[PDB]
């Protein structure tokens, strides 16, 4: 199957109250494996998945040094950005960064990513060809120019198509029991009386992995929509995910509706009918 590795970085300035709050987290597909929190006692990159603990001291010392370097750069970025936008030295601002790679079913490089956001808005992003940048405003243009001269894209391309993919494969193997698995959803339907004229039918999908899933309602065959409510897929806390889809139906007509579940772990789509 296809897999991905992603690192997410968030740095928030808190002027007058010490250094910015920096949080870094690493993911392989839908499971987190490492984190770094500037406010944590350790001040070390820390494991968030037992399988990453198979990496030795050199890994942890090396990743700790590199994550602190990322923290340091973002600390400077916050200063640079407020300067770029002529903002007050007393306000709180946020810089976010994400980068990573995807591999196809062959586990060979598929695509790479490297982008930034300032105060919740796109700032600059590496394009798909991994050779050009996408800058929004004037400020981002300044950054772009600097990165082009510093050959940042060239170094990222080498990483994304090389080290990134190679280590992703290493992780996939070292944590195969959890990463290369598929947990089919456990499904059931609930009924909720809303009035003596109608009721809410809710289709649940629980304990599934990966997070990708499709839940849809149909009536006597036709596809229901706009009448169906969906919630964002959410974490159960045990490494698995949940999701539900609902539809308001007229009392006595419940059995006319059907829920359809599509998931990687299901040999074939599921169909649930109430009662």
């Amino acid at each position: 199957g296809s897999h991905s590795m992603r690192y997410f970085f968030t740095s928030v300035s808190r002027p007058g109250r010490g250094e910015p709050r920096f949080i870094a987290v690493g993911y392989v597909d839908d499971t987190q494996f490492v984190r770094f929190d500037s406010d944590a006692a350790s001040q070390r990159m820390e494991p968030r998945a037992p399988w990453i603990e198979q990496e030795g001291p050199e890994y942890w010392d090396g990743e700790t040094r590199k994550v602190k370097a990322h923290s340091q750069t973002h600390r400077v970025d916050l200063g640079t950005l407020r300067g770029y936008y002529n903002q007050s030295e007393a306000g709180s601002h946020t810089v976010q960064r994400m980068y990573g790679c995807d591999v196809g079913s062959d586990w060979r490089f598929l695509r790479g990513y490297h982008q930034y956001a300032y105060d919740g808005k796109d700032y600059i992003a590496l394009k798909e060809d991994l050779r050009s940048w996408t800058a929004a405003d004037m400020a981002a243009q300044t950054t772009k120019h600097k990165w082009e001269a510093a050959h940042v894209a060239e170094q990222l391309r080498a990483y994304l198509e090389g080290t990134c993919v190679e280590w992703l494969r290493r992780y996939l193997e070292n944590g195969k029991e959890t990463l290369q698995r598929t947990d089919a959803p456990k499904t059931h339907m609930t009924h909720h009386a809303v009035s003596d004229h109608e009721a809410t039918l809710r289709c649940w999908a629980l304990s599934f992995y990966p997070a990708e899933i499709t839940l849809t309602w149909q009536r006597d065959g036709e596809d229901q929509t706009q009448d169906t409510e969906l919630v964002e897929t959410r974490p159960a806390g045990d490494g698995t995910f949940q999701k539900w889809a609902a539809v308001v139906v007229p009392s006595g007509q419940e059995q006319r509706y059907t829920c359809h579940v599509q998931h990687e772990g299901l040999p074939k789509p599921l169909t649930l009918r109430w009662e």
Binding site: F8, T10, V12, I23, V25, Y27, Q32, R35, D37, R48, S92, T94, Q96, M98, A117, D119, G120, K121, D122, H188, T190, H192, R202, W204, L206, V231, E232, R234, P235, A236, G237, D238, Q242, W244
Partner: protein, 100 residues
Amino acid sequence: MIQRTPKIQVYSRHPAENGKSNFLNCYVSGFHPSDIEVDLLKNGERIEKVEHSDLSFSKDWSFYLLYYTEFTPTEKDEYACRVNHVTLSQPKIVKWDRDM
């Protein structure tokens, strides 16, 4: 700047049964800035033993966090999640309806 109101989902890890240990989850997502206050309440009172996931975010840069605590459902006890964000004028309270 950019400000997004947090979406809030309060639910249990497993379908709830009185007497069986379970986990109460409060998943907050789609918010920005990251500064947010989240408390899990039992009969209106704040639960002290509450842990949360490491701050992360989606493709649109909006943040998401999972707050959780181990609890044993009772027929009487009421649980809820209290969230306050810059986007919220007052704390928002989403009750655990135990519908699953």
